[PDB]
């Protein structure tokens, strides 16, 4: 199809900045091929001469020179192509990663992380072998074949006809064997995955199996899966040996037909001994290249397909709204909800909000309560310009929230997650996350605002220690107080709390809800109980998507 | 591996014969050379026939030997995997054995083939010409030292590059797995900068990797050319001297080339064999680390000085001198401290672990003396954590059954447990397959499925607990009503560890334990209208 041509053109254009390396590689390749083609001719002429010191010396010197030059070029070309491959891989990975960060949250809510890892780890390497490996081997292999056949036709115009007639019986066999192998491999892979799924299922439901004593049935099912896979293994192992036997028988026959015909032609008087030796060497060598050409051309299509699969991810269009530009100097902090209704694109036509309407004020600490199927999370999220409301509008200082700059908005308004997430960086990097620059004096001030210093300050070097992977070494309560300190380091104007008091101290919540970051800054707290009532200036319940 | 000691021996014969059959193309070739300088067709025809026959026989024997070896190795691999999984499941990794066995088998086969080939080639060369063979053996080690040294360095650089790529991959996957927070803090440029900084380190290693590759190629080519020239010179001088003819030299040259190829293959193959052999010992070490006939039970149980503990040590005992007893046809409940771990008593009722002291005989027979096959289908009940397997619903609701129940029986069991409505509402009837590990299940559906799986076997004892905790209030009320409305209170023993006092209200004799033994008990009405634990809990 034309899609393959489009992909090939895109892959050519991706390698545009590698001209100075590709030129040297394609020069050394030609030199090496031309050097390796001509050696047996000089070997045959030496043999004929032996049966005049000047000609002998000239032939020996030329053979040695060609051998050495080819040996050098065959290494220079490989080095250049390896470097080019590495450069292309490192170039494509960065583009693939930097294009994904701009996607909407629904794309990540839908796509499994395994697919992203597969694209960013495996296919970006398979598509990088197209030019340095496939298009290199195919070129030299084909050229070498053309040169060898030209020399063979020059030496004897009759003996070459037999090889020209014999070649299809090799090409067809190689094609058939490759076609069968490429599907046997994937059948084996599917069987192995299905077999592993049984062990995964047994691990998942271990308690019930031990309670009912059903091990003797899970073992039987696993044995059935193994016996299903063994047959495919045996079939592949048999096919390989059958192909090898056929290849060996065919070659011996060709050689004996070549040897007999060549001897009968020499004894007539139309050929010499060195010419027969050179022809035999050429005819022996041609077959390996003929087979490897088919192998490489068959392999190239997998790389093309992997390239298509990778490129299908970085060409997809996002669903973000139009970018904003506004950035006032002093936000008042008044937030109003007007007839807000929302439906998740992943599960559409099942609204969670039905005409929600309320108003927030700087000092009016407003608390939201009521389960509503955990719908309190949704109203918090869409106040940060993470999702767009399908109905109504949400506005900041008499302007829509979507009209403000992305970088500016998330400095005035910040929220704490319901389940805090921490990154594998240091303590200082996690507190100052997202900031261009910070000073350790502010970090101490931010940490002391959440009383997390009682744990941080016992730790060696202070704030420069490495936090465990995704906060592995921190306790549940400790992570809560670290996530809070990540907020007041930014000096927010609007603050949102997702039931932080459920794990953190209630008095700590009151201090966080009454400090300088909350004295005249709008605070919205989400509570699963009536605990927020002790300070809320405007309590608001909402159920079934409708406010109380 | 011993059980296949005969077949492998047969293989170990055939390969040897094949290794002798394929040495007829070089030898006779030299013979043909010695024929072309001394010019009948009879000897030519004889040589041709011998060469063709020997080559064909060698090919056929190799094919047969390979087939036999592969057939045996498949069975060995399958048996090993089955045993490993059985041991792992009963113990309470699998893919490691699967990914190791194929590599080990392939590398061992190649090693054996090429070792036998090399031995045969060396023997025939030594019989041919002693002096040239000695020269080749002397010059082999000196020309096979530097390429290994360069190759090790190149391999180290390659593995370093691959490890760096893997590190960057995670540096990226970790960033991409927490997108809501990154978007909330507007920190995408930071993630891009971190990824770029990670790639800037591999950019340095790639250059030296390429340089090492080029140097390795040059060294290999130079050694390959030098080796052949060194013996060609001495062979030519010997032939010119007149001690040997040209055909012997041609045969020796071909034999030397094949011998060098075999040695190089063996050197390339050996490390993988060593690594796989070393790795299999870990799997080995991980793997290596009768009852009376029951007829019927009336549901009468009792314990005297019963004790049980955790498998880690007998000092983690959660009971000490317990005296639990549930009359047949009477339903009772137990309570106690959260940290007391009384739930293990239910496990003690299921004969999962033998008592640490005393006896727990029930229905006039010892608890661990009955047959395990028939006891597990008459004393089990719904588990503490309801779940649905990946099998079909008609099979999920009857797991662990020796005989598959009929459709009418399954429907009746579901209706008695209230799961008939869930089965009817599910698409495609009972033939629908539930999601693996309860991926698409629901609390009420899971509770109904657990109740159906418990009641399908008509148990003689009930150990249902925490089933209503995961279930809804309506489902809990329905379960309680079904338990209370059973014929003559189900005419069997129930010792449910309820989580709500609503079920314990109708208890025949409630009880509460403390300090590893039952510390209080009596009628529910008496307990709730006195100084008992139930009244204190209700008032508090």
């Amino acid at each position: 199809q034309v899609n393959n041509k489009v992909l090939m053109w895109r892959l050519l254009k991706l390698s545009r900045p590698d001209l100075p390396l590709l030129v040297a590689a394609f020069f050394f390749l030609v030199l090496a091929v031309l050097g390796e083609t001509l050696i047996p001719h000089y070997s045959g002429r030496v043999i004929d001469i032996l049966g005049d010191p000047h000609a002998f010396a000239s032939a020996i010197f030329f053979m040695c020179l060609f051998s050495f030059g080819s040996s050098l070029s065959a290494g220079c070309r490989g080095g250049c192509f390896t470097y080019t491959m590495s450069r292309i891989n490192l170039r494509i990975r960065e583009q693939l990663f930097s294009s994904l960060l701009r996607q909407d949250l629904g794309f990540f809510q839908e796509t499994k992380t395994g697919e992203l890892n597969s694209r960013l780890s495996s296919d970006t390497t398979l598509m990088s072998n197209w030019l340095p490996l496939n298009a290199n081997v195919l070129l030299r292999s084909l050229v070498k074949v053309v040169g060898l056949y030209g020399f063979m036709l020059s030496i004897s115009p009759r003996l070459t006809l037999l090889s020209l007639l014999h070649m299809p019986f090799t090409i067809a066999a190689e094609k058939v064997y490759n076609t069968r192998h490429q599907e046997v491999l994937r059948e084996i892979q599917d069987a192995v995955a299905r077999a592993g799924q049984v062990v995964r299922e047994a691990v998942g439901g271990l308690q019930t199996v031990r309670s009912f004593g059903a091990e003797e049935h899970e073992v039987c099912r696993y044995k059935e899966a193994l016996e299903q896979c063994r047959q495919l293994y045996w079939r592949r192992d048999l096919e390989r040996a059958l192909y090898l036997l056929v290849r060996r028988v065919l070659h011996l026959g060709v050689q004996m037909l070549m040897l007999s015909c060549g001897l009968q032609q020499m004894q007539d008087g139309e050929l010499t001994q060195g010419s027969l030796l050179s022809f035999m060497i050429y005819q022996e060598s041609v077959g390996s290249y003929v087979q490897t050409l088919v192998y490489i051309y068959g392999d190239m299509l997998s790389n093309v397909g992997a390239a298509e699969k990778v490129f299908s991810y970085m060409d997809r269009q996002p669903n973000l709204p139009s970018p904003g530009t506004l950035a006032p100097t002093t936000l008042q902090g008044v937030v109003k909800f007007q007839d807000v209704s929302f439906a998740y694109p992943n599960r559409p036509d099942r609204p969670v909000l039905k005409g929600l309407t309320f108003t927030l004020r700087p000092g009016e600490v407003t608390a939201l309560v009521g389960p509503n199927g955990s719908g309190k999370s949704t109203v918090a999220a869409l106040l940060q310009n993470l999702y767009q409301p399908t109905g109504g509008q949400v506005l900041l200082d008499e302007k829509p929230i979507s009209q403000y700059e992305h970088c500016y908005l998330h400095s005035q308004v910040v929220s704490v997650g319901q389940e805090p997430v921490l990154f594998s960086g240091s303590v200082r990097n996690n507190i100052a996350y997202g900031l261009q620059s910070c000073e350790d004096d502010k970090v101490m001030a931010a940490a002391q605002a959440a009383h997390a210093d009682d744990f941080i300050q016992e730790m060696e070097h202070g704030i420069y220690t490495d936090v465990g992977e995704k906060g592995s070494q921190l306790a549940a309560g400790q992570k809560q107080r670290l996530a809070i300190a990540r907020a007041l380091v930014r000096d927010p104007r609007v603050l949102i709390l997702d039931e932080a008091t459920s794990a953190l101290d209630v008095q700590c919540e009151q201090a966080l809800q009454d400090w300088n970051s909350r004295g005249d800054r709008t605070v919205l707290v989400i509570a699963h109980r009536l605990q927020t009532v002790q300070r809320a200036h405007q309590i608001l319940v909402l159920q079934e998507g409708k406010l109380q | 591996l011993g059980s296949e000691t005969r077949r492998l021996s047969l293989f170990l014969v055939l390969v040897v014969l094949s290794s002798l059959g394929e040495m007829a193309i070089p030898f006779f070739t030299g013979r043909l050379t010695d024929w072309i300088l001394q010019d009948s067709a009879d000897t030519f025809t004889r040589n041709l026939t011998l060469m063709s026959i020997l080559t064909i026989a060698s090919a056929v024997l190799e094919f047969v030997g390979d087939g036999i070896y592969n057939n045996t190795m498949g069975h060995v691999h399958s048996h090993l995997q089955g045993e490993v999984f059985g041991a792992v499941l009963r113990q309470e990794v699998t893919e490691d054995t699967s990914t190791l066995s194929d590599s080990l088998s392939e590398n061992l086969s190649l090693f054996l083939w090429y070792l036998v080939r090399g031995l045969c080639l060396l023997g025939i060369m030594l019989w041919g010409s002693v002096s040239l063979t000695m020269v080749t053996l002397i010059t082999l080690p000196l020309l096979f030292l530097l390429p290994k040294k360069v190759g090790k360095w190149y391999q180290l650089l390659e593995v370093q590059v691959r490890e760096s790529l893997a590190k960057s991959s995670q540096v990226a996957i970790e960033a991409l797995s927490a997108m809501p927070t990154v978007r909330s803090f507007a920190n995408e440029e930071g993630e891009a900068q971190k990824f770029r900084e990670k790639l800037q380190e591999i950019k340095t290693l790639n250059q030296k990797e390429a340089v090492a590759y080029a140097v390795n190629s040059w060294t290999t080519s130079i050694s390959g050319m030098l080796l052949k020239v060194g013996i060609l010179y001495i062979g030519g001088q010997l032939v010119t001297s007149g001690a040997v003819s040209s055909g012997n030299l041609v045969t020796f040259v071909l034999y030397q080339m094949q011998f060098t190829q075999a040695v190089e293959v063996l050197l390339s193959i050996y490390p993988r064999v060593q690594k796989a052999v070393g790795s299999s010992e870990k799997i080995f070490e991980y793997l290596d680390r009768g009852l009376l006939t029951p007829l019927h039970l009336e549901g009468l149980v009792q314990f005297q000085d019963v004790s049980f503990a955790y498998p880690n040590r007998p000092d983690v005992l959660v009971l000490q001198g317990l005296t639990f007893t549930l009359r047949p046809g009477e339903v009772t409940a137990l309570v106690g401290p959260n940290g007391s771990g009384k739930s293990t008593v239910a496990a003690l009722l299921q004969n999962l672990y033998q008592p640490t002291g005393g006896q727990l005989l029930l229905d006039g027979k010892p608890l661990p003396q009955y047959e395990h096959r028939y006891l597990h289908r008459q004393v089990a009940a719904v588990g503490q954590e309801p779940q649905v397997f990946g099998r079909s619903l008609q099979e999920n609701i009857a797991y662990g059954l020796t005989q598959k129940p009929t459709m009418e029986e399954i429907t009746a069991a579901a209706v008695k447990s209230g799961a008939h409505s869930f089965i009817s509402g599910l698409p495609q009837g009972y033939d629908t397959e539930v999601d693996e590990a309860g991926s698409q299940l629901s609390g009420g559906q899971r509770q109904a499925v657990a109740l159906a799986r418990a009641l399908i076997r008509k148990p003689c004892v009930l150990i249902l607990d925490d089933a209503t905790s995961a279930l809804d209030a309506n489902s809990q009320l329905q379960v309680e009503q079904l338990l209370y409305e059973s014929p003559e209170r189900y005419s069997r023993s129930v010792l449910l560890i309820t989580q709500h006092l609503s079920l314990v209200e109708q208890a025949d004799h409630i009880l509460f334990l403390e300090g590893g033994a039952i510390r209080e008990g009596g009628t529910h009405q008496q307990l709730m209208e006195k100084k008992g634990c139930y009244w204190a809990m209700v008032q508090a």
Partner: peptide, 9 residues
């Protein structure tokens, strides 16, 4: 069976 060489880059 016989050893198979990796394709040279």
């Amino acid at each position: 069976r016989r050893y198979q060489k990796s394709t040279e880059l």
